[PDB]
Amino acid sequence: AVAFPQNRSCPYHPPTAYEPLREERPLSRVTLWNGRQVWFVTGHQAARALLGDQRLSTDSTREDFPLPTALLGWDDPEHNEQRRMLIPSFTLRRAESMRPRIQAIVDRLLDDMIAAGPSAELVGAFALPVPSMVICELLGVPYGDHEFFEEQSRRLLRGPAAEDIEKAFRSLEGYFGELIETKRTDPGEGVIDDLVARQREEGRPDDDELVQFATVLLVAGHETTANMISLATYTLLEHPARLAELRADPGLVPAAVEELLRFLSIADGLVRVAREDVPVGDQVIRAGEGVVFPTSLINRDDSVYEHPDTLDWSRSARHHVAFGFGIHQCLGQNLARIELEIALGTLLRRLPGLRLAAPADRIPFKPGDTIQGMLELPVTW
Numbered sequence: 001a002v003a004f005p006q007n008r009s010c011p012y013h014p015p016t017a018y019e020p021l022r023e024e025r026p027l028s029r030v031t032l033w034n035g036r037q038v039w040f041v042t043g044h045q046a047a048r049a050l051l052g053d054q055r056l057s058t059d060s061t062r063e064d065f066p067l068p069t070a071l072l073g074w075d076d077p078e079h080n081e082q083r084r085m086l087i088p089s090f091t092l093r094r095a096e097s098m099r100p101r102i103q104a105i106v107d108r109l110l111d112d113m114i115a116a117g118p119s120a121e122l123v124g125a126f127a128l129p130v131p132s133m134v135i136c137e138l139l140g141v142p143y144g145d146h147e148f149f150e151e152q153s154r155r156l157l158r159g160p161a162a163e164d165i166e167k168a169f170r171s172l173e174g175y176f177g178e179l180i181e182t183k184r185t186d187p188g189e190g191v192i193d194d195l196v197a198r199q200r201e202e203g204r205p206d207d208d209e210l211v212q213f214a215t216v217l218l219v220a221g222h223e224t225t226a227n228m229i230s231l232a233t234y235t236l237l238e239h240p241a242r243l244a245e246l247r248a249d250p251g252l253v254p255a256a257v258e259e260l261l262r263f264l265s266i267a268d269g270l271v272r273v274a275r276e277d278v279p280v281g282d283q284v285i286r287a288g289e290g291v292v293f294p295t296s297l298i299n300r301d302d303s304v305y306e307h308p309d310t311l312d313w314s315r316s317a318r319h320h321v322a323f324g325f326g327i328h329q330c331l332g333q334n335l336a337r338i339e340l341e342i343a344l345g346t347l348l349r350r351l352p353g354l355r356l357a358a359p360a361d362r363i364p365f366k367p368g369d370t371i372q373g374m375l376e377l378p379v380t381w
């Protein structure tokens with residue numbers, strides 16, 4: 001009987017206690033804090049089929065939803081209508097168009113970090129601000145508000161008190177309300193403009209719903225990307241031969257981003273409840289049963305990935321579930337991939353001497369029940 005969720009022992013490996021469940025495919029079981037048993041999807045093929053099944057729910061308002069302690073929560077057709085409105089802002093072409101803006105953001109934060117001193121706390125100096133500044137550009141927040149937006153987005157993650165997190169949420173919701181007005185009578189480019197055009201053309205996203213979309217995109221897009229920058233950098237520094245390959249051939253960085261997404265799987269333990277019976281081979285997930293998708297184990301299914309517990313830039317990470325799959329699959333994945341390519345590739349290019357400025361086991365990382373990644377990352381160069 002294995003308790004879920006558990007803390008990682010090593011920032012870049014799945015929790016040690018899950019290792020015996022990896023052989024039990026496609027479905028195993030884990031126990032939540034209150035003794036409730038839930039299904040634990042260990043099979044890659046099964047995880048992909050299940051994450052496409054409308055009989056699983058993300059609606060945390062259901063009495064039967066598993067407590068391990070808007071888009072998400074929404075079942076279709078509401079959910080489908082929300083996604084339809086946002087998908088066009090998140091195409092591959094729209095991500096590729098953002099490259100020069102992302103490069104400028106990354107370059108400015110590295111210039112400032114290098115100027116300030118010979119060492120840095122990389123999470124606060126780089127990993128945290130890159131994605132909130134990209135989301136700033138994505139939403140079309142005007143230049144003069146960039147500092148305000150970065151400051152409030154940081155407060156929403158770093159707090160420290162629950163009061164700071166709440167005041168930041170209210171400040172951003174209030175700001176998004178004002179900006180929708182500003183952009184109606186002074187249209188620019190970005191997701192808010194895209195959704196203002198949709199509202200005039202279709203009446204579809206009302207102002208309250210547009211504000212919720214902006215808040216969701218920031219929350220979905222900020223910490224995940226920041227933790228991938230921080231944990232990827234720590235993982236690379238702890239694998240000198242793998243890091244050396246990327247320094248030698250910058251052309252490897254896009255494939256390395258996929259392999260790091262697979263190997264790190266920071267959005268770990270996706271949760272669903274079955275609304276109706278769902279069969280998986282000769283097993284049946286009954287209506288009301290919890291279903292947990294341990295991203296990190298699914299991405300290490302050795303039926304799909306040879307030597308799955310090793311970092312390998314040459315062994316295909318294609319079809320990984322780091323961005324989820326099916327109904328709720330990450331809307332930002334095209335944008336996230338380019339942010340990571342530019343952030344990690346530019347860091348590696350500019351700072352070839354980059355190294356940890358503390359022993360690896362004194363560097364704090366997130367506990368098991370949240371998005372995985374580094375809290376701090378002291379580096380020198």
Ligand code: HEM
Pocket residue numbers: 071072083135138216217218220221222224225228266267270271321322323324325327328329330331332333335336
């Ligand atoms: C490396 C960075 C990221 C990772 C690892 C990641 C991972 C994920 C995962 C696993 C989900 C599905 C959750 C589930 O099925 O329960 C998801 C959903 C989502 N992501 Fe991402 N994400 C990243 C970056 C972004 C960015 C940059 C944005 C927006 C700018 C974004 C917006 C979203 C949205 C809006 C959803 C919900 C889609 C829906 O519910 O229909 N994410 N993300």
